[PDB]
Structure formats: C-alpha cells, structure tokens
Amino acid sequence: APMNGKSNNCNEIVKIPFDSSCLLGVKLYNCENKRVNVNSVEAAFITIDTAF
Amino acid sequence: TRVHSYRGVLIITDELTVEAGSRVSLSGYVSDGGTSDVFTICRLLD
C-alpha cells in the first residue's frame, strides 16, 4: 500500500478461495518509500465495490 | 561509716542513619514514522 503511488503493467488479481476466511494484510508504506506505523488513522474501512 | 550514695542522669549514645536509593527507567523504540496531522495520500512533483 504505497502512499505515493506505485513498471505499471497490469495489476494482478488477488484470489481468495470462495468460502474459507482470509485475512487481508495491508502494509502502510509512508510516502517516500518506507514502512510507517498505523498511526493517525483512527478508522479504516474496506469497501469492496457494491458488495459491503 | 556513711555508705551514702549518689544519683545521676540517664545518658545514652546512639548513631542513627537513614538511607534511600534511586533507579532510572527508560522506554524507547526505533522510530517507524510518528503521529502526524492530516495523514493523507500525496503526489509530490518537482
């Protein structure tokens, strides 16, 4: 999850087995190119399109 | 013969000392960013 914006090519498709229960791991890279702690952010929302 | 005695005061000697201690506690960690204001995505340009 680069905060600056990432070879563009074509983005790969994340494949979760239907059913089961995956754990989405989002890593906050600060906006030079560095990992940053999950600070400031007090609310994070996943908003998969027209699903939930 | 008299045998007559006398009387004194109660004199006592003692050495008193009270002591204490000290300990310094520190808690730190490598910086991984820091609590910032207006944490938003950005697009730098030169």
Side-chain angles (χ1 to χ4, degrees), chain A residues 2-5 11-18 22-30 32-33:
Chain A
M3 282 188 128
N4 211 345
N11 73 329
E12 277 331 89
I13 289 294
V14 162
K15 314 192 221 203
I16 286 144
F18 207 46
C22 154
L23 161 76
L24 206 87
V26 167
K27 294 202 311 303
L28 295 201
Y29 282 109
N30 80 2
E32 318 313 10
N33 298 99

